[PDB]
């Protein structure tokens, strides 16, 4: 079963890789996305700063929060 120095690597590498892809979003729905085009002028900070907005609004109007927005983390100022 897991030893320690395996729990730290997997945490330590989620830590490394974390947060949305931002730019498989616009693999999806950027410039010649394969779903659409809508956010094709939304460069990966501007997704990730509405990203981070979007948390806020749910958290500060007391929604449930979407599950993919759970991995958008640390300060949302």
């Known amino acids: 079963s897991w ?3 395996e729990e730290e690597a997997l945490l330590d590498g989620m830590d490394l890789v974390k947060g949305p892809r ?3 979003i616009l693999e999806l729905y950027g410039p010649g ?6 956010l094709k002028y939304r460069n ?4 990730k700063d509405k990203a981070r907005n979007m ?3 749910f958290l500060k109007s007391g929604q449930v929060v979407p ?3 759970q991995c ?3 300060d949302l100022r």
Do not use: P
Request: hydrophobic fraction near 40%; avoid cysteine.
């Open 72 to 74: 958008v983390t640390g």
């Open 44 to 47: 990966q900070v501007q997704l």
């Open 3 to 5: 030893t320690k120095e």
């Open 22 to 24: 931002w730019s498989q």
């Open 33 to 38: 996305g394969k779903k659409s085009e809508v």
């Open 55 to 57: 948390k806020l609004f």
């Open 67 to 69: 599950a993919a927005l």
